[PDB]
Design a protein around this ligand. Structure first.
Ligand SMILES: [Mg+2]
Ligand SMILES: [Mg+2]
Ligand SMILES: [Mg+2]
Ligand SMILES: [Mg+2]
Ligand SMILES: [Mg+2]
Ligand SMILES: [Mg+2]
Ligand SMILES: [Mg+2]
Ligand SMILES: [Mg+2]
Ligand SMILES: [Mg+2]
Ligand SMILES: [Mg+2]
Ligand SMILES: [Mg+2]
Ligand SMILES: [Mg+2]
Ligand SMILES: [Mg+2]
Ligand SMILES: [Mg+2]
Ligand SMILES: [Mg+2]
Ligand SMILES: [Mg+2]
Ligand SMILES: [Mg+2]
Ligand SMILES: [Mg+2]
Ligand SMILES: [Mg+2]
Ligand SMILES: [Mg+2]
Ligand SMILES: [Mg+2]
Ligand SMILES: [Mg+2]
Ligand SMILES: [Mg+2]
Ligand SMILES: [Mg+2]
Ligand SMILES: [Mg+2]
Ligand SMILES: [Mg+2]
Ligand SMILES: [Mg+2]
Ligand SMILES: [Mg+2]
Ligand SMILES: [Mg+2]
Ligand SMILES: [Mg+2]
Ligand SMILES: [Mg+2]
Ligand SMILES: [Mg+2]
Ligand SMILES: [Mg+2]
Ligand SMILES: [Mg+2]
Ligand SMILES: [Mg+2]
Ligand SMILES: [Mg+2]
Ligand SMILES: [Mg+2]
Ligand SMILES: [Mg+2]
Ligand SMILES: [Mg+2]
Ligand SMILES: [Mg+2]
Ligand SMILES: [Mg+2]
Ligand SMILES: [Mg+2]
Ligand SMILES: [Mg+2]
Ligand SMILES: [Mg+2]
Ligand SMILES: [Mg+2]
Ligand SMILES: [Mg+2]
Ligand SMILES: [Mg+2]
Ligand SMILES: [Mg+2]
Ligand SMILES: [Mg+2]
Ligand SMILES: [Mg+2]
Ligand SMILES: [Mg+2]
Ligand SMILES: [Mg+2]
Ligand SMILES: [Mg+2]
Ligand SMILES: [Mg+2]
Ligand SMILES: [Mg+2]
Ligand SMILES: [Mg+2]
Ligand SMILES: [Mg+2]
Ligand SMILES: [Mg+2]
Ligand SMILES: [Mg+2]
Ligand SMILES: [Mg+2]
Ligand SMILES: [Mg+2]
Ligand SMILES: [Mg+2]
Ligand SMILES: [Mg+2]
Ligand SMILES: [Mg+2]
Ligand SMILES: [Mg+2]
Ligand SMILES: [Mg+2]
Ligand SMILES: [Mg+2]
Ligand SMILES: [Mg+2]
Ligand SMILES: [Mg+2]
Ligand SMILES: [Mg+2]
Ligand SMILES: [Mg+2]
Ligand SMILES: [Mg+2]
Ligand SMILES: [Mg+2]
Ligand SMILES: [Mg+2]
Ligand SMILES: [Mg+2]
Ligand SMILES: [Mg+2]
Ligand SMILES: [Mg+2]
Ligand SMILES: [Mg+2]
Ligand SMILES: [Mg+2]
Ligand SMILES: [Mg+2]
Ligand SMILES: [Mg+2]
Ligand SMILES: [Mg+2]
Ligand SMILES: [Mg+2]
Ligand SMILES: [Mg+2]
Ligand SMILES: [Mg+2]
Ligand SMILES: [Mg+2]
Ligand SMILES: [Mg+2]
Ligand SMILES: [Mg+2]
Ligand SMILES: [Mg+2]
Ligand SMILES: [Mg+2]
Ligand SMILES: [Mg+2]
Ligand SMILES: [Mg+2]
Ligand SMILES: [Mg+2]
Ligand SMILES: [Mg+2]
Ligand SMILES: [Mg+2]
Ligand SMILES: [Mg+2]
Ligand SMILES: [Mg+2]
Ligand SMILES: [Mg+2]
Ligand SMILES: [Mg+2]
Ligand SMILES: [Mg+2]
Ligand SMILES: [Mg+2]
Ligand SMILES: [Mg+2]
Ligand SMILES: [Mg+2]
Ligand SMILES: [Mg+2]
Ligand SMILES: [Mg+2]
Ligand SMILES: [Mg+2]
Ligand SMILES: [Mg+2]
Ligand SMILES: [Mg+2]
Ligand SMILES: [Mg+2]
Ligand SMILES: [Mg+2]
Ligand SMILES: [Mg+2]
Ligand SMILES: [Mg+2]
Ligand SMILES: [Mg+2]
Ligand SMILES: [Mg+2]
Ligand SMILES: [Mg+2]
Ligand SMILES: [Mg+2]
Ligand SMILES: [Mg+2]
Ligand SMILES: [Mg+2]
Ligand SMILES: [Mg+2]
Ligand SMILES: [Mg+2]
Ligand SMILES: [Mg+2]
Ligand SMILES: [Mg+2]
Ligand SMILES: [Mg+2]
Ligand SMILES: [Mg+2]
Ligand SMILES: [Mg+2]
Ligand SMILES: [Mg+2]
Ligand SMILES: [Mg+2]
Ligand SMILES: [Mg+2]
Ligand SMILES: [Mg+2]
Ligand SMILES: [Mg+2]
Ligand SMILES: [Mg+2]
Ligand SMILES: [Mg+2]
Ligand SMILES: [Mg+2]
Ligand SMILES: [Mg+2]
Ligand SMILES: [Mg+2]
Ligand SMILES: [Mg+2]
Ligand SMILES: [Mg+2]
Ligand SMILES: [Mg+2]
Ligand SMILES: [Mg+2]
Ligand SMILES: [Mg+2]
Ligand SMILES: [Mg+2]
Ligand SMILES: [Mg+2]
Ligand SMILES: [Mg+2]
Lengths: 77, 100, 62, 176, 48
RNA sequence: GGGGGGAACCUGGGGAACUGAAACAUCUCAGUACCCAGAGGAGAGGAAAGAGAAAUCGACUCCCUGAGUAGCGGCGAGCGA
RNA sequence: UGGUUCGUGGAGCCAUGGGGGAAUCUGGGCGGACCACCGCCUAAGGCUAAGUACUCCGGGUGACCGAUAGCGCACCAGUAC
RNA sequence: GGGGUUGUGGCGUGCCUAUUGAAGCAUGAGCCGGCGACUCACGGUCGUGGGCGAGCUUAAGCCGUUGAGGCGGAGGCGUAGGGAAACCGAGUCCGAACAGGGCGCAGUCCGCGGCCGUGGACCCGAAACCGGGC
RNA sequence: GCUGGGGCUAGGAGUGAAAAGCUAACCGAGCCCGGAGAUAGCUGGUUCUCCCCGAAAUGACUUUAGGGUCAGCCUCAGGCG
RNA sequence: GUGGAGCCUGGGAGUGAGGGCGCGAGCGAUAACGUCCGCGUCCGAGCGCGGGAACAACCGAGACCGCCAGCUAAGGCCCCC
RNA sequence: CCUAAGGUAGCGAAAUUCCUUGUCGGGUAAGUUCCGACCUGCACGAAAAGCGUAACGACCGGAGCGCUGUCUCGGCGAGGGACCCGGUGAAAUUGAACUGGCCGUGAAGAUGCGGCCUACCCGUGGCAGGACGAAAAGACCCCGUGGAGCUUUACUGCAGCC
RNA sequence: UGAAAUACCACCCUGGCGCGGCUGGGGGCCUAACCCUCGGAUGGGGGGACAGCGCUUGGCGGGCAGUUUGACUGGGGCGGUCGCCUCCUAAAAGGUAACGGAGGCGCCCAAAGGUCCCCUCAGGCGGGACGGAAAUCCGCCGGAGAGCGCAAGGGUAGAAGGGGGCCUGACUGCGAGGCCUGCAAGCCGAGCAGGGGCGAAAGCCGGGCCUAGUGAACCGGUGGUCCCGUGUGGAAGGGCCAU
């Protein structure tokens, strides 16, 4: 007779498009709770903090020291 | 059927309106027929020369319409699509009204 | 003898010209109230996949 | 609709159209049969009790008879009005459902069993202060209290003197 | 909830609705705001 | 005149359950099994107080279509003009 | 209440156990609540071949059986038991 | 060159069923013979061999045969689709829209095989239930 | 009290000094024929040869857990390359 | 990287009791041929063959058939052998 | 404090007492039983009666006398079988058998695998340790959206009665 | 004056009589239906419009009938558990079990929502009238230990925190493209249109710092709409949108 045995259906978080991968405008690039990663160039983020491409291009992960981490998208030039 | 779940009878009957009781309202139904195919015969197409041909058949009320080019010939029908009415305005028939 | 159609289906689903099986969206019969227009609005018809193959074998004659 | 295996004294529920409150609860599972719940109850308005038994399944139907604190304001008809010193709503309780409505006081704070915003039991405190406005300065004499009721008191207790009276026995329990 | 309660909004004499959720007890005792109707555009809007 | 018999078939009077619904009760199985009365080489039905939308048809029965349609339905199972 | 696809449904139509209860063609019923138009038909008496069902019985056939099959019985079987 | 037999030598845990796993001390079988279980009807869906193709096909029946084959077009599937429907139609739905976006340009008839449905549906097996009788 | 002969009561019915006893050698509801080839998510059983490939015992939902549905894993034909 | 690889449309499945060993964890007692997951393996379906005395899953090794040829694996080389 | 009211008479380690072989007493060389008491009655109690009762009982307990093969502890003897010969001649069971022991091993209890040890072929009378011997498709146990009989303030009906 | 005040008008009560229509309750007596009886009667007694019986109503109703009485589970039962969120287990992608460890939810905010402009914390050492050990004030020191309605987690002072002004985009028609995924669902979403809010503008707004606060279909209810409306018109009843 216990008092536990509970949990929540996993949510499958994290980067969902890595640096150098080609996307299309719309692709959600990152799923995360806080803001582990922040919007960048052509990268708006959503209500739930979900970063998503804003234009067809590639993904770049700029690490900005104590300024956080960024995910940009340099469109195809 | 099965699992003992709920089939997929979860999806709903938006098919609203599908049955009163005396039954089905007896009303006139229309048969397509694109001018594209009256082009088969050249005379005076009348909804019958059609049934007998191989299109429409007993469905009753014929409504020549659609795609294809018209042809210089009289077309008696129970209806015409705005578009074919046109393509026939290129010279032909327009015996609308129809019926006694 | 002669297969019977599954009235409960024809009453809520449609076979399309392509062969597609289209059923109205589900989820807005009394949920509504605290539902974005996005949700409530997003109730158009939809594909149905892998289950239409089943779902279709019941509209046999129709 | 709560079952029984999930009762506890204090739980209030609706049985036989009436209001109760399990006051005794003991799970019973002897032999290899199915378990059984043997409780004892009390009506919320009348005192009547009744021990009963139920199987493991059987659901009961929990009720929401929370007990806020009301407040007397004024008489009217054969009723008297109170107020929940909380949301200041107005309750017109019929003299019957106001335990010891007499020996009360137009302004005293008492308790009521709110069942859907309508008290079915309005009790004051075991003893309240009241100004006797009667009695002959003459020992164990009768004394009409400011609320019209009468009570037995000693001598020294004379007109105007405010006393105490156990609202259960309406007996003089001393002076103010 | 109870103190909560559901409710919609009527275009002032007519149809349409919004259906939000008032909140009894606290800021309540009626309530109306400005919102856009399927027909024409923007107006007040009462409860009911 | 009647009475009793007759393998099925027939009409009428009564009339189940197991089953199916992956429980179950409405529903189904089915007005089937069966019981009883009667009929006869057949029985029923049959000349419109019908149909039902057609300036329409024109007793009745029977086959094929219409049609698994119209519908019916814990709108479930399924029944089905 | 029953019949119909109709499970109380907007529930007509047909039938009828109970209550009430007409008129005779300016009469009466139906066209799926109801109403008004427009139609259809003449209830509360009766009979009627033929087309249809079946196969104890006679015959004719058989990509039917050929004595553990075929009817239970090819034989003195609804028998011995 | 072969048959029969088999002394010694080497190797060697019946068969089926069911099981994670049986020689198993788990099930079934005394042995031999014969009977003994995935079919059929009407549908449906794939596939396939053919006929004919914007068309393909008849059903009851009728005439003929009497192991002879015709007729028969009622009807059926297909030529359009969308929409709950009115309706419209190579479009239409939603919409205020001339944005958007959802659905939209192929057949039939036989034979054959696979599988699904409805029937007892691969074959035996209940405890039981209901009717009428004894 | 025992006993012969003649009789009556029987199937959710009888009878019972009561045990759920007895009702034609097994009675918590007789026997026979019928509905009927009831249903059995259970146990058993399933018959000629060769050749190629060749699993699963997981997930999700399941009055689900020894059964299913979708998926995963196998296979065949057509297409792509 | 041409593989019994892949991918796409479709027909047919079976399976949805797994098991041991290794490694990483949880439950257990730093128990169990215990138990519940993960990565892998083998048995399952390789109770076919060598070694392990004998023995499904430990070591060796994936058995189309034939030969009185040869080299090797693990393991072995005093006799059984 | 609570209750509708808190078990009266009587009986009580009882066909009722868990603890329990309670504790005293009796009987006995020795008594978990028996009888008599005690009363912290786990969990008696008054017509599902309470407490007694002569008589009755193929009812159940305890004790003693008598007498015994019941026993110490077995012995002899009779007849009917058993065994032998002539006559008639079944049975369940049965995968096939060329059917040994120990120590191991193996699905964890081996005639059947390994190692070792025994062992000439075949019966007859006996014995029952094994062949997980025979017999009944476990009664127990769980499983089955199996079945029934029974119950009720489970659900829904029906007869009946109002 | 008393709890109340007083007129005049209202509405409506308590109980009362008056006409107008509408509905009932019983009391008796009768005999002839109906019932019971009587030396056998087209008759006499007794009961009597009661009962009995027919249709219909509400109820009582294990006397009887049909059935239901969940699953997981180190056997079953009893206990506990059953959906959703957070953390661990979970072996540095995702995912991953156990009657493994530990906690939450079934709500809530008309400001706790938009937007624009402002402000920066908890603590710590001083310093100060009433003043704890933090009430309010002043000075430093203090990058986040504060806060962010609630569990925990990620997040965050170059605000997601605090304050204020206007507001309500807690928009309607749409929705490219993705996440997650067996199905069904769940989640993110740029951009366009209509019509708005805030801002000088750039822009921002189709709820809430984010992960729980939930419920397929069926059957019905309310608005709306004009779509069908059983010969016609119209209703009845449906349909679609909304809830
Ligand atoms: Mg768990
Ligand atoms: Mg778990
Ligand atoms: Mg988890
Ligand atoms: Mg988690
Ligand atoms: Mg709706
Ligand atoms: Mg809309
Ligand atoms: Mg058709
Ligand atoms: Mg009949
Ligand atoms: Mg009959
Ligand atoms: Mg039944
Ligand atoms: Mg059933
Ligand atoms: Mg005749
Ligand atoms: Mg004839
Ligand atoms: Mg006749
Ligand atoms: Mg029927
Ligand atoms: Mg109904
Ligand atoms: Mg009916
Ligand atoms: Mg009538
Ligand atoms: Mg009637
Ligand atoms: Mg009439
Ligand atoms: Mg008519
Ligand atoms: Mg009429
Ligand atoms: Mg007529
Ligand atoms: Mg006649
Ligand atoms: Mg022959
Ligand atoms: Mg022979
Ligand atoms: Mg024979
Ligand atoms: Mg076998
Ligand atoms: Mg096993
Ligand atoms: Mg053996
Ligand atoms: Mg055994
Ligand atoms: Mg064996
Ligand atoms: Mg077995
Ligand atoms: Mg045997
Ligand atoms: Mg087959
Ligand atoms: Mg076929
Ligand atoms: Mg074919
Ligand atoms: Mg389009
Ligand atoms: Mg698209
Ligand atoms: Mg072809
Ligand atoms: Mg086929
Ligand atoms: Mg199939
Ligand atoms: Mg089949
Ligand atoms: Mg008889
Ligand atoms: Mg006698
Ligand atoms: Mg006799
Ligand atoms: Mg019977
Ligand atoms: Mg009886
Ligand atoms: Mg007797
Ligand atoms: Mg007997
Ligand atoms: Mg019986
Ligand atoms: Mg029985
Ligand atoms: Mg049957
Ligand atoms: Mg059978
Ligand atoms: Mg059954
Ligand atoms: Mg291979
Ligand atoms: Mg595996
Ligand atoms: Mg369920
Ligand atoms: Mg399973
Ligand atoms: Mg599958
Ligand atoms: Mg495949
Ligand atoms: Mg499993
Ligand atoms: Mg496993
Ligand atoms: Mg493994
Ligand atoms: Mg171990
Ligand atoms: Mg081992
Ligand atoms: Mg294990
Ligand atoms: Mg296996
Ligand atoms: Mg392998
Ligand atoms: Mg072996
Ligand atoms: Mg070797
Ligand atoms: Mg070896
Ligand atoms: Mg080996
Ligand atoms: Mg091996
Ligand atoms: Mg190989
Ligand atoms: Mg060598
Ligand atoms: Mg070597
Ligand atoms: Mg050597
Ligand atoms: Mg005692
Ligand atoms: Mg005594
Ligand atoms: Mg004693
Ligand atoms: Mg006792
Ligand atoms: Mg002594
Ligand atoms: Mg002595
Ligand atoms: Mg003693
Ligand atoms: Mg003794
Ligand atoms: Mg004693
Ligand atoms: Mg007693
Ligand atoms: Mg008593
Ligand atoms: Mg007695
Ligand atoms: Mg006594
Ligand atoms: Mg006696
Ligand atoms: Mg002796
Ligand atoms: Mg002797
Ligand atoms: Mg002798
Ligand atoms: Mg002798
Ligand atoms: Mg002899
Ligand atoms: Mg030997
Ligand atoms: Mg051994
Ligand atoms: Mg040996
Ligand atoms: Mg022996
Ligand atoms: Mg012996
Ligand atoms: Mg045995
Ligand atoms: Mg068994
Ligand atoms: Mg169950
Ligand atoms: Mg059952
Ligand atoms: Mg009188
Ligand atoms: Mg008389
Ligand atoms: Mg009289
Ligand atoms: Mg009289
Ligand atoms: Mg009467
Ligand atoms: Mg009644
Ligand atoms: Mg009852
Ligand atoms: Mg019962
Ligand atoms: Mg019965
Ligand atoms: Mg039944
Ligand atoms: Mg269970
Ligand atoms: Mg247990
Ligand atoms: Mg339980
Ligand atoms: Mg429980
Ligand atoms: Mg879920
Ligand atoms: Mg981790
Ligand atoms: Mg991970
Ligand atoms: Mg500070
Ligand atoms: Mg200080
Ligand atoms: Mg202070
Ligand atoms: Mg201070
Ligand atoms: Mg401080
Ligand atoms: Mg603001
Ligand atoms: Mg979209
Ligand atoms: Mg998309
Ligand atoms: Mg999906
Ligand atoms: Mg929130
Ligand atoms: Mg905010
Ligand atoms: Mg339903
Ligand atoms: Mg509705
Ligand atoms: Mg409505
Ligand atoms: Mg209209
Ligand atoms: Mg009509
Ligand atoms: Mg009409
Ligand atoms: Mg009309
Ligand atoms: Mg009019
Ligand atoms: Mg409407």
């Amino acid at each position: 007779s216990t008092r536990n045995g509970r949990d929540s259906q996993a949510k499958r978080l994290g980067v969902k498009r890595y640096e150098g991968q080609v996307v299309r405008a719309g692709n959600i690039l990152v799923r995360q709770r806080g803001t582990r990663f922040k919007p960048g160039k052509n990268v708006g983020m959503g209500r739930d903090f979900t970063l998503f491409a804003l234009v067809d291009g590639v993904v770049e992960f700029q690490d900005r020291g104590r300024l956080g981490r960024y995910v940009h998208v340099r469109p195809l030039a | 059927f099965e699992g003992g779940r709920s089939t997929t009878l979860m999806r709903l009957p938006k098919r609203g309106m599908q049955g009163q009781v005396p039954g089905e309202i007896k009303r006139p139904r229309y048969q397509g027929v694109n001018l594209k195919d009256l082009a088969r015969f050249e005379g005076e197409v009348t909804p019958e020369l059609l049934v007998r041909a191989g299109l429409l058949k007993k469905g009753y009320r014929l409504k020549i319409l659609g795609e294809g080019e018209a042809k210089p010939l009289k077309v008696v029908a129970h209806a015409f699509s705005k578009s074919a009415l046109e393509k026939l305005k290129a010279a032909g028939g327009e015996p609308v009204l129809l019926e006694a | 003898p002669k297969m019977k159609t599954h009235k409960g289906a024809k009453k809520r689903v449609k076979i399309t010209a392509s062969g597609k099986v289209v059923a109205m969206k589900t989820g807005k019969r009394h949920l509504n109230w605290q539902k974005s227009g996005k949700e409530i609005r997003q109730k158009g018809r939809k594909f149905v996949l892998a289950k239409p193959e089943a779902e279709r074998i019941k509209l046999l004659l129709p | 609709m709560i079952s029984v295996t999930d009762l506890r004294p204090g739980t209030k529920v609706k049985m036989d159209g009436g209001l109760w409150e399990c006051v005794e609860y003991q799970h019973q599972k002897l032999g290899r049969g199915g378990a059984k719940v043997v409780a004892k109850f009390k009506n919320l308005e009348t005192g009547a009790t009744v021990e009963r038994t139920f199987n493991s399944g059987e659901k009961l139907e929990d009720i929401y008879v929370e007990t806020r604190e009301l407040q007397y304001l004024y008489p009217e008809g054969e009723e008297m009005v109170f107020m929940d010193l909380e949301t200041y709503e107005q309750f017109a309780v019929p003299r019957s459902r106001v335990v010891g409505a007499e020996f009360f006081k137009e302004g005293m704070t008492a308790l009521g069993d709110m069942y859907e915003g309508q008290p079915i039991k309005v009790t004051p405190p075991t003893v309240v202060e009241l100004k006797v406005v009667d009695t002959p300065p003459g020992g164990s004499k009768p004394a009409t209290l400011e609320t019209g009721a009468v009570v037995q008191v000693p001598l020294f207790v004379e007109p105007g003197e405010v006393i105490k009276v156990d609202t259960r026995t309406g007996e003089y329990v001393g002076r103010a | 909830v109870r103190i909560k309660l559901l409710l919609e909004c009527t275009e002032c004499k007519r149809r349409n609705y919004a259906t939000e959720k008032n909140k009894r007890n606290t800021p309540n005792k009626l309530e109306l705001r400005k919102y856009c109707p399927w027909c024409r555009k923007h107006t007040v809007h009462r409860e009911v």
